[PDB]
Paper text:
SgvM is found in the biosynthetic gene cluster of the antibiotic viridogrisein and catalyzes methyl transfer to the C3 (i.e., β) position of α-ketoleucine (4-methyl-2-oxovalerate). The N-terminal domain (I6 through H147) consists of helices that mediate dimerization, while the C-terminal domain (F149 through H338) consists of a Rossman fold.
However, SAM could not be observed in the structure but rather density for MTA, likely derived from SAM hydrolysis, is seen in the near vicinity of the metal. The distance from the MTA sulfur atom to C3 position of α-ketoleucine is ca. 7 Å, suggesting that this represents a nonproductive complex. This non-productive complex resembles that observed in the previously reported structure of SgvM. Presumably, the metal ion acts as a Lewis acid to trigger the soft enolization of the ketoacid substrate and facilitates electrophilic methylation.
Author numbering:
A (entry chain A), B (entry chain A): 6 to 339
The structure:
Amino acid sequence: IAAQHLADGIAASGPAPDLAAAAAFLEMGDRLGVVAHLDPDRTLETAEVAAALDLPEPALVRYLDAVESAGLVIREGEGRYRACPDFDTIRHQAGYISWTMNANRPFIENARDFFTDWDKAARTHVRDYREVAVSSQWMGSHAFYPTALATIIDAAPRKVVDLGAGTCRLLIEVLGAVPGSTGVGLDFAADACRAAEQAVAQAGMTDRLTVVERTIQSVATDPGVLEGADVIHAGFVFHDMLPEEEDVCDQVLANCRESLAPGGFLAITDAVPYLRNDRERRFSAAVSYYHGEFMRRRLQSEEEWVERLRGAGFSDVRALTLAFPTGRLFLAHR
Amino acid sequence: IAAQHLADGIAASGPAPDLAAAAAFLEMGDRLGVVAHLDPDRTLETAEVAAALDLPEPALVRYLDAVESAGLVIREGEGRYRACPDFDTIRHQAGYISWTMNANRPFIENARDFFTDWDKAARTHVRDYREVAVSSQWMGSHAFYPTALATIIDAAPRKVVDLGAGTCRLLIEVLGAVPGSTGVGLDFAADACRAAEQAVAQAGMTDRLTVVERTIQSVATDPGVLEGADVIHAGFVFHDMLPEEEDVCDQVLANCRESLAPGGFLAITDAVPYLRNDRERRFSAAVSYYHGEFMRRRLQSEEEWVERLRGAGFSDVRALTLAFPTGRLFLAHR
Ligand SMILES: CSC[C@H]1O[C@@H](n2cnc3c(N)ncnc32)[C@H](O)[C@@H]1O
Ligand SMILES: CSC[C@H]1O[C@@H](n2cnc3c(N)ncnc32)[C@H](O)[C@@H]1O
Ligand SMILES: CC(C)CC(=O)C(=O)O
Ligand SMILES: CC(C)CC(=O)C(=O)O
Ligand SMILES: [Zn+2]
Ligand SMILES: [Zn+2]
């Protein structure tokens, strides 16, 4: 009796109000720099963080008080705030919403332009690659990054190479797990290389781990840095050179197979296109439509990837379903 | 055994991949004009809709095929598409994400400016009121609009007034339910008034329902149009004149009480600030922080609203919890 309208509405909205609010608070706070100071295991001290971020302290305090009202942080004492116990899961979920609604917003808002003159639209409406990187890392935290770590650590490698390694977090975490091991982080971006180069410094791995600043294409002609590696990792990278650079790509793959030490494998995480199964189909379709229609980059099915890795001379290929919908981890044994 | 990593990841992501993908597809499609042609009870014919929307048909077909892969539409025949059975619930959930991440995106991206010089930020970073209106209507579909309808229809009114009525859908639906009834839709926006004025035309209610183009403030001095109404409705409107126009507002409220026919009531849906209960607190906080910090509009608690309505001379005030988190429906009896 109008308690019906209420219960019916609650069931229809489900978790969407909570998620919409978490994602907006967390994107806003991350753009401010605040989210990197929130952690379930310690407090953020407003007086210091406001100074470190060059923000007015009363403004920062009203933000953290709003986030405290939302249940995302806990006010421990006066001027001190702690993230809620399940913050990292909430931030992981926010990553999916940030990626489709923020990182890829130029495609949402400008689809008509992309439909009528793609070449002009592709250069006019461009994605903010800081947002692409942050939301990808939030999604990866629980849905593909752990699986890649464990696989690399368990191979107990001596040399590990990462193509498109960014700030080299994955290499730093692997080297800190195999006490005797070396790493190579390859990235063609200047600022990415500069931050990876000092994060490795502050971990003391400045000798065990070098930060080469080249393209993955450059590997096709200079495969020297790949020599003798036990594991080569590429995360969501190889698709970005298809179909315009299929030969260069086929030849980087062939280079990787020859450069592998005995018993070594190339680990590729990438997205497969348009899955039909009920769990993955909806996010699969967004990942595929964004890549196929707006970025014009070719995503390959498992069948195509196995084909392509066989043709590069790998002797066996194992595909693993990742929790990230349409994410697959291909392990290509030499 | 690495089937653990998979099940753990799936539990951590929960419904977020599905929601993120639905919201992006549906905002993109709505901006294109396509979503208004999707319905669970009939098909969209691509050849005709592509022409009506001035879109290349192959482009429209790739979009609908992507949305079909996502499970949001069904391809009935060749060139014909039907929305999935629960489309309206999915679109309702997408409304929360659209509102926090799209409609209010100027606040997410520019919080630093709002913190350091508000007056300059408020006029530089402005919300797209087409996006505000669409996402509000998607949220309202299952979470506040039904409760307001049923209350108005059940009062069996002779005259109904709506302050900030937009395209007058709510009035059209009420007049089509009380066979003998009149309505007044008040809105100060030119284009809103022009569309309400022809939607009422195509319903034949062009006589029973007039579309006055004034401000709700203008009611404070010209209360004539309010005369004799059985029900006055205002949806998410009165807060937008607090605190800068408290006297004008207090006097519109007093005007409404005096203009009511005997047995009549004023129905106000509005948002209360920063609730603490577990269901509503997170979205409550986003609604409140957006209004308090970025729009500088005053949201009142239930206690304050009842106070304010008593002081305007209403004899009894009933507050109803809406499914929309922090939404409240206040019924103020004359
Ligand atoms: C994990 S995919 C994106 C990351 O990998 C880097 N990257 C993207 N494309 C390439 C490329 N062709 N070669 C080397 N690094 C790349 C980018 O600088 C970013 O850090
Ligand atoms: C339901 S809140 C927004 C809708 O109500 C209208 N509206 C907003 N503010 C006012 C106002 N002061 N007076 C009259 N209509 C308003 C807007 O034109 C829009 O259609
Ligand atoms: C995790 C990936 C899907 C990220 C990506 O492919 C991109 O945004 O470019
Ligand atoms: C449904 C309302 C919360 C919409 C609103 O207040 C706004 O965006 O201005
Ligand atoms: Zn990509
Ligand atoms: Zn508002």
